[PDB]
């Protein structure tokens, strides 16, 4: 499509971070209200999830079991909410600083852009071992995506670039986007297409796998967009941070 739709969220404040599940339920970290909100497909009523004590949360992910993870940026922690019981567990990361961005894979491994420490960390399900990924030269990284193959992409915000660590490789690759300004947020689809919220240019850009020529998506009127998700259908959702809204574009 070339015409975006605004989702019927209410009362957002500087939202940053969006996730979508296979049912088309959309989850947003409503950063400036210290809460996580969700909207089911076709619904006008949003639901505030029972997280507690959040501070400027930035980034949300959801696994197959309905577990919701949030990077609780202002508290240097990652919290997960177990489905049904609504038990909150602080994941046993350590030493985080203003984390901003989270992803989870099929195995329940959790990946966090540890923004304030210029690093990306991962924690396997149930583990007390966190692993620093061998990205190099990061500056305030702010967004992480992982595909089915286990390739990890990161928006290296402070360097105006997107980097990837290909599965099985220990060598970082810089993707051939051009002209980025403080990018924050990355998503990847099944086809390997990469989507980035080019925050400081008020636009969303995408690169097909193997292509060296980005395209700009036909969103309009964005302001410091900061978070992107893509569903199985190729619909693209963006947290339009500076306009307190979430916008979507069908393929």
């Amino acid at each position: 499509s070339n015409t975006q739709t605004v989702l019927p969220f209410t009362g957002l404040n500087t939202p940053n971070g969006v996730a979508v599940d296979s049912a088309g339920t959309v989850y947003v970290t409503d950063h400036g209200n210290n809460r996580v909100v969700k909207l089911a497909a076709g619904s006008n009523t949003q639901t505030v999830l029972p997280f507690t004590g959040l501070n400027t949360p930035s980034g949300v992910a959801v696994d197959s079991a309905g577990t919701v993870w949030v990077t609780d940026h202002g508290n240097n922690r990652v919290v997960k909410l177990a489905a049904g019981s609504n038990t909150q567990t602080v994941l046993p990361f350590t030493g985080l600083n203003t984390p901003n961005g989270v992803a989870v894979d099929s195995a329940g491994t959790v990946y966090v852009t540890d923004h304030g420490n210029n690093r990306v960390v991962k924690l396997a399900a149930g583990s007390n071992t966190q692993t620093v990924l061998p990205f190099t030269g990061l500056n305030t990284p702010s967004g992480v995506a992982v595909d089915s193959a286990g390739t990890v992409w990161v928006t290296d915000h402070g360097n105006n670039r997107v980097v990837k660590l290909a599965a099985g490789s220990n060598t970082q690759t810089v993707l051939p986007f051009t002209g980025l300004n403080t990018p924050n947020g990355v998503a990847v689809d099944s086809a390997g297409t990469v989507y980035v919220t080019d925050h400081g240019n008020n636009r969303v850009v995408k690169l097909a796998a193997g292509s060296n020529t980005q395209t700009v998506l036909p969103f309009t009127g964005l302001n410091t967009p900061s978070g992107v998700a893509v569903d199985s259908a190729g619909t693209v959702w963006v947290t339009d941070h500076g306009n307190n809204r979430v916008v979507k574009l069908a393929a």
Side-chain angles (χ1 to χ4, degrees), residues 82-87:
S85 65
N86 289 324
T87 300

Side-chain angles (χ1 to χ4, degrees), residues 102-128:
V102 57
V104 62
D105 71 8
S106 33
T109 299
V110 177
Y111 304 72
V112 177
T113 26
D114 188 24
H115 161 266
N117 287 316
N118 294 339
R119 69 180 179 167
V120 182
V121 191
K122 69 174 178 181
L123 181 79
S127 174
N128 295 302

Side-chain angles (χ1 to χ4, degrees), residues 8 10 44 81 110 126 132 134 142 147 168 177 182 189 215 221 223 234 248:
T10 310
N44 267 15
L81 183 71
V110 177
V132 181
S142 289
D147 69 11
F177 288 105
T182 54
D189 64 15
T215 65
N223 181 318
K248 76 175 197 203

Side-chain angles (χ1 to χ4, degrees), residues 1 9 11 20 27 34-35 47 56-58 67 79 91 101 123 146 158 163 166 172 175 185 190 205 216 223 246 250:
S1 170
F9 287 103
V20 56
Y27 302 72
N34 293 340
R35 68 187 182 170
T47 298
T56 53
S58 305
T67 307
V79 185
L91 277 60
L123 181 79
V146 176
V163 295
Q172 148 178 306
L175 281 62
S190 58
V205 298
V216 183
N223 181 318
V246 180

